[PDB]
Amino acid sequence: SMQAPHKEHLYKLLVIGDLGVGKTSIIKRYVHQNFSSHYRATIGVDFALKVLHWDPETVVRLQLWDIAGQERFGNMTRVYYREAMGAFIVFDVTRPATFEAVAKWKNDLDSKLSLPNGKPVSVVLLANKCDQNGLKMDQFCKEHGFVGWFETSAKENINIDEASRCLVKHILANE
Numbered sequence: 001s002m003q004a005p006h007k008e009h010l011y012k013l014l015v016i017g018d019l020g021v022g023k024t025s026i027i028k029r030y031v032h033q034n035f036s037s038h039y040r041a042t043i044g045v046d047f048a049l050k051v052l053h054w055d056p057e058t059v060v061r062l063q064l065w066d067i068a069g070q071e072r073f074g075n076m077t078r079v080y081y082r083e084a085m086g087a088f089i090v091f092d093v094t095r096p097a098t099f100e101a102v103a104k105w106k107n108d109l110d111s112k113l114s115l116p117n118g119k120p121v122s123v124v125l126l127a128n129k130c131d132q133n134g135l136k137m138d139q140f141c142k143e144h145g146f147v148g149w150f151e152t153s154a155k156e157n158i159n160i161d162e163a164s165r166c167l168v169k170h171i172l173a174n175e
């Protein structure tokens with residue numbers, strides 16, 4: 001048979017952002033290679049598993065937590081975030097009110113979760129629905145403690161493989 005991988009990683013990753021920004025769609029594209037325009041609102045939280053053959057020696061398993069957009073108005077997001085090693089925070093480029101919610105989610109996450117060493121977790125910002133300022137997005141990341149941002153489309157499959165690759169790169173880098 002095949003030589004077993006040298007190393008296998010399992011990481012919990014959060015997907016957060018306000019109602020309808022595309023959290024579920026990004027996960028469905030990334031994991032199941034599919035999209036539909038039909039809005040099925042998440043109730044509480046749903047889960048998916050991405051297997052990355054990271055290198056010939058290395059598997060990375062990503063336990064994706066698809067959190068519903070109104071969960072930040074509840075009382076225990078602290079439980080949702082427990083043991084996560086990274087997050088995507090998503091907004092809808094067509095609805096600027098969802099961009100305002102990004103800092104709300106980021107502040108909620110950073111207040112309730114740190115790595116064992118007390119460091120904040122790696123977070124990438126996804127500017128989603130780009131199928132429907134570069135410097136300013138960079139400045140925003142530096143001001144709010146994001147490692148990166150990408151324009152994404154679950155519909156056209158833009159930059160979702162790249163954003164996830166770059167987030168896992170950062171999570172390994174703190175190891």
Ligand SMILES: Nc1nc2c(ncn2[C@@H]2O[C@H](COP(=O)(O)OP(=O)(O)OP(=O)(O)O)[C@@H](O)[C@H]2O)c(=O)[nH]1
Pocket residue numbers: 017018019020021022023024025026036037038039040041042043067068069070128129130131132152153154155156
């Ligand atoms: N055009 C376009 N529509 C998108 C994209 N991503 C999501 N949508 C649509 O936007 C709507 C909301 O998508 P969801 O993935 O359910 O959003 P959500 O953030 O999971 O919503 P909640 O779970 O209710 O908080 C749906 O009608 C999707 O088809 C995208 O990249 N492009």
Ligand SMILES: [Br-]
Pocket residue numbers: 037038039
């Ligand atoms: Br539809």
Ligand SMILES: [Br-]
Pocket residue numbers: 018019069070
């Ligand atoms: Br809301």
Ligand SMILES: [Br-]
Pocket residue numbers: 018097098
């Ligand atoms: Br809103």
Ligand SMILES: [Mg+2]
Pocket residue numbers: 023024025040041042066067068069
């Ligand atoms: Mg959803």
